[PDB]
Design an enzyme around this catalytic site. Sequence first.
Site, PDB file in Angstrom:
ATOM      1  N   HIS A  40      17.074 -27.580  61.203  1.00  5.56           N
ATOM      2  CA  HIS A  40      15.758 -27.020  60.905  1.00  5.56           C
ATOM      3  C   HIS A  40      15.738 -25.502  60.952  1.00  5.56           C
ATOM      4  O   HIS A  40      16.366 -24.902  61.825  1.00  5.56           O
ATOM      5  CB  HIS A  40      14.753 -27.495  61.947  1.00  5.56           C
ATOM      6  CG  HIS A  40      14.314 -28.900  61.752  1.00  5.56           C
ATOM      7  ND1 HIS A  40      13.356 -29.238  60.828  1.00  5.56           N
ATOM      8  CD2 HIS A  40      14.703 -30.051  62.348  1.00  5.56           C
ATOM      9  CE1 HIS A  40      13.169 -30.545  60.861  1.00  5.56           C
ATOM     10  NE2 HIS A  40      13.967 -31.061  61.780  1.00  5.56           N
ATOM     11  N   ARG A  47      16.876 -29.457  71.189  1.00  2.41           N
ATOM     12  CA  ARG A  47      17.495 -28.291  70.565  1.00  2.41           C
ATOM     13  C   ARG A  47      18.824 -27.989  71.236  1.00  2.41           C
ATOM     14  O   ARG A  47      18.873 -27.716  72.430  1.00  2.41           O
ATOM     15  CB  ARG A  47      16.556 -27.090  70.649  1.00  2.41           C
ATOM     16  CG  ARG A  47      15.214 -27.336  69.994  1.00  2.41           C
ATOM     17  CD  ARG A  47      14.286 -26.152  70.179  1.00  2.41           C
ATOM     18  NE  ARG A  47      12.964 -26.466  69.656  1.00  2.41           N
ATOM     19  CZ  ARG A  47      11.995 -25.583  69.452  1.00  2.41           C
ATOM     20  NH1 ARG A  47      12.188 -24.289  69.705  1.00  2.41           N
ATOM     21  NH2 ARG A  47      10.822 -25.999  68.999  1.00  2.41           N
ATOM     22  N   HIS A  68      19.245 -29.970  66.165  1.00  3.83           N
ATOM     23  CA  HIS A  68      18.598 -30.883  67.101  1.00  3.83           C
ATOM     24  C   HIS A  68      19.495 -32.088  67.322  1.00  3.83           C
ATOM     25  O   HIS A  68      19.812 -32.819  66.382  1.00  3.83           O
ATOM     26  CB  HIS A  68      17.269 -31.356  66.525  1.00  3.83           C
ATOM     27  CG  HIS A  68      16.246 -30.275  66.397  1.00  3.83           C
ATOM     28  ND1 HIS A  68      15.098 -30.244  67.159  1.00  3.83           N
ATOM     29  CD2 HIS A  68      16.193 -29.187  65.593  1.00  3.83           C
ATOM     30  CE1 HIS A  68      14.383 -29.186  66.825  1.00  3.83           C
ATOM     31  NE2 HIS A  68      15.022 -28.531  65.873  1.00  3.83           N
ATOM     32  N   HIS A 110      13.336 -22.682  62.200  1.00  3.12           N
ATOM     33  CA  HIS A 110      12.207 -22.480  63.097  1.00  3.12           C
ATOM     34  C   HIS A 110      11.589 -21.113  62.860  1.00  3.12           C
ATOM     35  O   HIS A 110      12.195 -20.231  62.244  1.00  3.12           O
ATOM     36  CB  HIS A 110      12.599 -22.682  64.566  1.00  3.12           C
ATOM     37  CG  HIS A 110      12.839 -24.124  64.921  1.00  3.12           C
ATOM     38  ND1 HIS A 110      12.100 -24.788  65.872  1.00  3.12           N
ATOM     39  CD2 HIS A 110      13.707 -25.039  64.417  1.00  3.12           C
ATOM     40  CE1 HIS A 110      12.515 -26.041  65.953  1.00  3.12           C
ATOM     41  NE2 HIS A 110      13.489 -26.223  65.080  1.00  3.12           N
ATOM     42  N   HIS A 119       0.862 -34.588  58.897  1.00  2.00           N
ATOM     43  CA  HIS A 119       1.358 -35.950  59.084  1.00  2.00           C
ATOM     44  C   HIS A 119       0.792 -36.923  58.059  1.00  2.00           C
ATOM     45  O   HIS A 119       1.508 -37.782  57.540  1.00  2.00           O
ATOM     46  CB  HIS A 119       1.037 -36.459  60.487  1.00  2.00           C
ATOM     47  CG  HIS A 119       1.421 -37.889  60.703  1.00  2.00           C
ATOM     48  ND1 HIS A 119       2.719 -38.281  60.954  1.00  2.00           N
ATOM     49  CD2 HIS A 119       0.681 -39.023  60.692  1.00  2.00           C
ATOM     50  CE1 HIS A 119       2.760 -39.594  61.098  1.00  2.00           C
ATOM     51  NE2 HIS A 119       1.538 -40.069  60.941  1.00  2.00           N
ATOM     52  N   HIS A 179       7.882 -29.542  53.474  1.00  2.00           N
ATOM     53  CA  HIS A 179       8.154 -28.836  54.718  1.00  2.00           C
ATOM     54  C   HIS A 179       9.376 -27.951  54.471  1.00  2.00           C
ATOM     55  O   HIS A 179      10.498 -28.447  54.381  1.00  2.00           O
ATOM     56  CB  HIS A 179       8.424 -29.860  55.827  1.00  2.00           C
ATOM     57  CG  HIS A 179       8.577 -29.257  57.187  1.00  2.00           C
ATOM     58  ND1 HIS A 179       7.788 -29.609  58.263  1.00  2.00           N
ATOM     59  CD2 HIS A 179       9.442 -28.322  57.645  1.00  2.00           C
ATOM     60  CE1 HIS A 179       8.164 -28.915  59.324  1.00  2.00           C
ATOM     61  NE2 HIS A 179       9.166 -28.129  58.977  1.00  2.00           N
ATOM     62  N   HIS A 224       8.937 -25.608  64.293  1.00  2.00           N
ATOM     63  CA  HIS A 224       9.446 -25.767  62.943  1.00  2.00           C
ATOM     64  C   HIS A 224       8.785 -24.742  62.027  1.00  2.00           C
ATOM     65  O   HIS A 224       7.596 -24.440  62.166  1.00  2.00           O
ATOM     66  CB  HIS A 224       9.082 -27.154  62.386  1.00  2.00           C
ATOM     67  CG  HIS A 224       9.914 -28.293  62.904  1.00  2.00           C
ATOM     68  ND1 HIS A 224       9.559 -29.609  62.698  1.00  2.00           N
ATOM     69  CD2 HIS A 224      11.080 -28.325  63.590  1.00  2.00           C
ATOM     70  CE1 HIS A 224      10.464 -30.400  63.245  1.00  2.00           C
ATOM     71  NE2 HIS A 224      11.397 -29.647  63.795  1.00  2.00           N
ATOM     72  N   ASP A 249      12.585 -28.003  56.889  1.00  2.00           N
ATOM     73  CA  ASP A 249      13.287 -29.251  57.132  1.00  2.00           C
ATOM     74  C   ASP A 249      14.543 -29.334  56.275  1.00  2.00           C
ATOM     75  O   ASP A 249      14.460 -29.563  55.065  1.00  2.00           O
ATOM     76  CB  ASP A 249      12.358 -30.422  56.813  1.00  2.00           C
ATOM     77  CG  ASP A 249      12.988 -31.767  57.078  1.00  2.00           C
ATOM     78  OD1 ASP A 249      14.131 -31.814  57.577  1.00  2.00           O
ATOM     79  OD2 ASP A 249      12.331 -32.773  56.764  1.00  2.00           O
TER      80      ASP A 249
END
Lengths: 140, 140
Positions: free
Chosen positions: B45, B128, B119, B47, B70, B79, B62, B82
């Site tokens: 990811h 993490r 992750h 961040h 969601h 996203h 994120h 991601d």
Amino acid sequence: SNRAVAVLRGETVTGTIWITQKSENDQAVIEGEIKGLTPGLHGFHVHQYGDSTNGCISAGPHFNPFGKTHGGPKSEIRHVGDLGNVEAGADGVAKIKLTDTLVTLYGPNTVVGRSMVVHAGTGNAGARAACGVIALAAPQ
Amino acid sequence: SNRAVAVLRGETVTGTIWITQKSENDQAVIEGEIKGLTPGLHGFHVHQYGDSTNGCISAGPHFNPFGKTHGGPKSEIRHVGDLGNVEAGADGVAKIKLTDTLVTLYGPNTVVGRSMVVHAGTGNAGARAACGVIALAAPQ
């Protein structure tokens, strides 16, 4: 963000340096601490790249976006990345606070993603003793 | 620059991830290697922050600049941060090459100065395992 931070990493020298700046038109404040210094004055510089794939070597050259030269007309241009010299106090820590630099977090000369480097005062890093990428941090 | 690099640092997981992108209108390529992974798939990811004053905790949440949710209408938004899951090969190294992400080095959504975080798959860092600031590198 109006706030960035560099965590300096090195064999013996480490540190944390914050940059805070309210807007593109405002003067930035550079503040933090550098530890593990041998006593006396040491150079403190923004370098062009944050790339740390090769220690402090991959930081590349001094950050001099305006092209100050050694002599001639352009020798009177300000070297943006030159943050002067720093030194540890009696407690062994250098408390850094620079309020008059041209460093910015905005516009074409932003230092986000570049590096801060401490220069001692033999090897391929020259005098570079520690370095860290100037990272985005949460705004204040 | 048209090139950035994150050097991931962690207790056991490390890595080097390059981002290359010819222009603001071109799709970026994310390529590199992550080492020290336990076998299997792990999250990867971007961040929000590169701030590493507190390990991988200070990377913040994120990176989701478009505000994917969601559920509901905004659950169909991409996203940006991601980067899917990654995994080590038989040689113990994960060779990363992602050519279809929305990650950019240009404009308001630039990831320069932000972080990449691996992750795993107990502590205050959650899962993490390693993180690194996305640093400017010399252009190619």
